[PDB]
Write a protein that binds this ligand. Structure first.
Ligand SMILES: [Zn+2]
Lengths: 82, 24, 62, 98, 213, 133
RNA sequence: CCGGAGCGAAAGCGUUUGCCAAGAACGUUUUCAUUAAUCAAGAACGAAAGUCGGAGGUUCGAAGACGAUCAGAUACCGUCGUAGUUCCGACCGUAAACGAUGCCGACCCGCGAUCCGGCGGCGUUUGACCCGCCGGGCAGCGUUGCGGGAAACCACGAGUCUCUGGGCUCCGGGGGGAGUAUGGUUGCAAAGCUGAAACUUAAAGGAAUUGACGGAAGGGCACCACCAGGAGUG
């Protein structure tokens, strides 16, 4: 690696390296639309929820705070947005 | 040995204080 | 008290001892081959010779 | 001059280890610096396994083993020919002898 | 002057019905001479006997202590006093590059027999495991050690002395712990290494005759 | 002890095979009754070879004779070294005493090794610089 | 079990369980918005030994007694054994307290493991295991080190210093006298910190090479050596 192109790196390296050591730093997180199996309202939930997220005006629990990404409850489908 | 030369100096200046404290 | 047992040398292992005067060999009895013991030997011994050990109990610790 | 990179022991990131006592001289030697030798040998040596087999009351009885953990200090391990001196470049070989 | 073995008369020690080989062996003691008798001198002897000498075909690394409780006509009956493994078995299981989980409980049976069971378990290396050391985190060790105490308490507190011995001749209490702790960390050599009988209830002839009966 | 077919009357042989001496102690199954006990020092008069394998061999042959007079036929071997805070390796009289019992017309069964080993030892004799010589 | 493994600012830290407070790393598209780095005189902690007042005192064991060994042996070895060794409260603030290597930050080789957190992937087993990636940490090998150095050796840099400058604290100036004298200061004491001079000396010392030597290891060879013997000699 004597003549390496530092201005135009492959997206595999930018996605692999640390979020702070990139060419331009970008978070590895995202937002998701968690859908409760019972109700139908869509609630935007952060990837690393860090908080016990429950549906407003309901009883079902959506996410559980973990070390990294939130562990969604069984059957709670989601989709990431951009 | 160097640790015993230090032990002798400790015992040497200890009796120096005895013969100096007795003269006051 | 044990009887004087005869033993035939089956293979010599080489010269041993402090001044190399002894020859540690493994013996083999003629009557009953159900016992094998190693014994030091002091003197010129050929292959297949027969020695007359008295104790026949203690080993030589190689 | 520094003779060994590991200072003759195995201590990385620590300040003090529990000192153990040697076997044949009873000298306080650190646990990591001591020259350990796990010897696993039968209670009955090969010179008497046949006599015990003939005197055994069972038909198939495997003789037990004697697990002895030996801790030798550097002074006694060299004297007992457990370890020896090696060449300046042959000291780096950490693989035990086969 | 006189030979001491002239007064020695032999008694036959016997094992309870929990074992197959009931005739255990012979023991000698001086005849009743003076104020001392021969019965009380025999009611304190402990016999460490391997399990293979009591059952038909079992393991030989498990020992059993049998204390004599009564002498009934030239043969003195024994009773369970404590279990222990062989030194060779204990030293052979303790290997390197693994962790050992020890646990001890103090549980009394349905009858007033206070026992102290000692459990020992080693982590098992996977078949496809390439990593040398098979260690368990401190929290995994606590859950395994907690599971040992939970099972040993349930298997002893809800049974009598006879049923516990029947659960000790085969190491069933060691097998279920190995199966229970499979979800935490696969164990290798779960055994009950020792069982101490701390407190013994008031000796009654009916309970002893029920065992040997 | 009249037994049918002349079965083996098992005993327990405690072999304290330490250094400087060797105890060949044969007891009953309970161990409380001593059948016969003879040491390596009882067969020699020089203190330097009380632990010699020859001294332990003579003791094993003497203790084997006393067992036959009383009815003992088989022996359960329980070898023991010094143990405890001191060394735990059996002395030179271990193999000699054990082999001499098997060669003296005795039966051996259930060999074991009961050496006192501490879960945490006390301070051993000799300073931290050890027995230097 | 127990590892060139973990944690802690060091000293140091290994049975189970409970309680109290604290901490690193990781995760974050949370918050404050320069609050930072290193730091004289100050301050906390600080192995072992030692001191003071109680409790305790199993082992070990300064001193001491005795038995050996020796020309002598108040040593080495052995048998007994005091203060100590353990705990509580209060002092001393010393170690080969060592990585003999201050702390913060930047750039700088490769490879395979290891501990912790996180992410992804294909199966096996009731989380465990297998294959990669990221951050942090204890280390290792190949570097025959792109470089450095008097070598030895150094990628926890001892690299980016004559092509000499990121910030800051402590600290060295030939070897002895000497960590001594005196003064100040601290301490119950032992002692700690601070600390010279007269005088004396041409070397002291570092790394490596060759040789010699070893009551160091391994491998070999002759009766000017020995074993077994023959002649003796004295
Ligand atoms: Zn030693």
């Amino acid at each position: 690696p004597l003549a390496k192109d530092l201005l135009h790196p492959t997206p595999e390296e930018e996605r692999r390296r640390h979020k702070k050591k990139r060419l331009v730093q970008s978070p590895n997180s995202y937002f998701m639309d968690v859908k409760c199996p019972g109700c139908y309202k869509i609630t935007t939930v952060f990837s690393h929820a860090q908080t016990v997220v429950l549906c407003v005006g309901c009883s079902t629990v959506l996410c559980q705070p973990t070390g990294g990404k939130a562990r969604l409850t069984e059957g709670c489908s989601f989709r990431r947005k951009q | 040995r160097a640790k015993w030369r230090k032990k002798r100096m400790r015992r040497l200046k200890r009796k120096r204080r005895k013969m100096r404290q007795r003269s006051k | 008290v044990q009887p004087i047992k005869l033993a035939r040398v089956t293979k010599v292992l080489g010269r041993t001892g402090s001044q190399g005067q002894c020859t540690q060999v493994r013996v083999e009895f003629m009557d009953d081959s159900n016992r094998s013991i190693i014994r030091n030997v002091k003197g010129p011994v050929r292959e297949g010779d027969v020695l007359t050990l008295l104790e026949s109990e203690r080993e030589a610790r190689r | 001059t520094k003779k060994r990179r590991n200072n003759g022991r195995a201590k990385k990131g620590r300040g003090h280890v529990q000192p153990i006592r040697c076997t044949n001289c009873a000298r306080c030697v650190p646990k990591d610096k001591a020259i350990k030798k796990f010897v696993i040998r039968n209670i009955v040596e090969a010179a008497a396994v046949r006599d015990i087999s003939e005197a055994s009351v069972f038909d198939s009885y495997v003789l037990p083993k004697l697990y002895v953990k030996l801790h030798y200090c550097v002074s006694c391990a060299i004297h007992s020919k457990v370890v020896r001196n090696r060449s300046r470049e042959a000291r780096k070989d950490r693989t035990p002898p086969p | 002057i006189v030979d001491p073995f002239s007064k020695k008369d032999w008694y036959d020690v016997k094992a309870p019905a929990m074992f197959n080989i009931r005739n255990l062996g012979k023991t000698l003691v001086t005849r009743t001479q003076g104020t001392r008798i021969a019965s009380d001198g025999l009611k304190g002897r402990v016999f460490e006997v391997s399990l293979a000498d009591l059952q038909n075909d079992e393991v030989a690394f498990r020992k059993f202590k049998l204390v004599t409780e009564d002498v009934q006509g030239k043969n003195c009956l024994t009773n369970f006093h404590g279990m222990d493994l062989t030194r060779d078995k204990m030293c052979s299981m303790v290997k390197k590059w693994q962790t050992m989980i020890e646990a001890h409980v103090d549980v009394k049976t349905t009858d007033g027999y206070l026992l102290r069971l000692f459990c020992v378990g080693f982590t098992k290396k996977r078949t496809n495991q390439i990593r040398k050391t098979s260690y368990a985190q401190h929290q995994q060790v606590r859950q395994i050690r907690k599971k040992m105490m939970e099972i040993m308490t349930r298997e002893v507190q809800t049974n009598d002395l006879k049923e516990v011995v029947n659960k000790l001749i085969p190491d069933s209490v060691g097998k279920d712990i190995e199966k229970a702790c499979q979800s935490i960390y696969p164990l290798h050599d779960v055994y009950v290494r020792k069982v101490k009988m701390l407190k013994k209830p008031k000796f009654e002839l009916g309970k002893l005759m029920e065992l040997h009966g | 002890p009249q037994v049918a077919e002349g079965e083996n009357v098992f005993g327990v042989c405690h072999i304290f095979a330490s250094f400087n001496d060797t105890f060949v102690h044969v007891t009953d199954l309970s161990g409380k009754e001593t059948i016969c006990r003879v040491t390596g020092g009882m067969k020699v008069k020089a203190d330097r070879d009380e632990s010699s394998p020859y001294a332990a061999m003579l003791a094993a042959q003497d203790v084997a004779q006393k067992c036959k007079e009383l009815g003992i036929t088989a022996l359960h071997i329980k070898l023991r070294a010094t143990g405890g805070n001191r060394t735990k390796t059996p002395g030179p009289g271990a193999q000699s005493a054990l082999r001499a019992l098997a060669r003296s017309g005795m039966k051996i069964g259930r060999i074991e090794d009961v050496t006192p080993i501490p879960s945490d030892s006390t301070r051993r004799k000799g300073g931290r610089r050890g027995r230097r010589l």
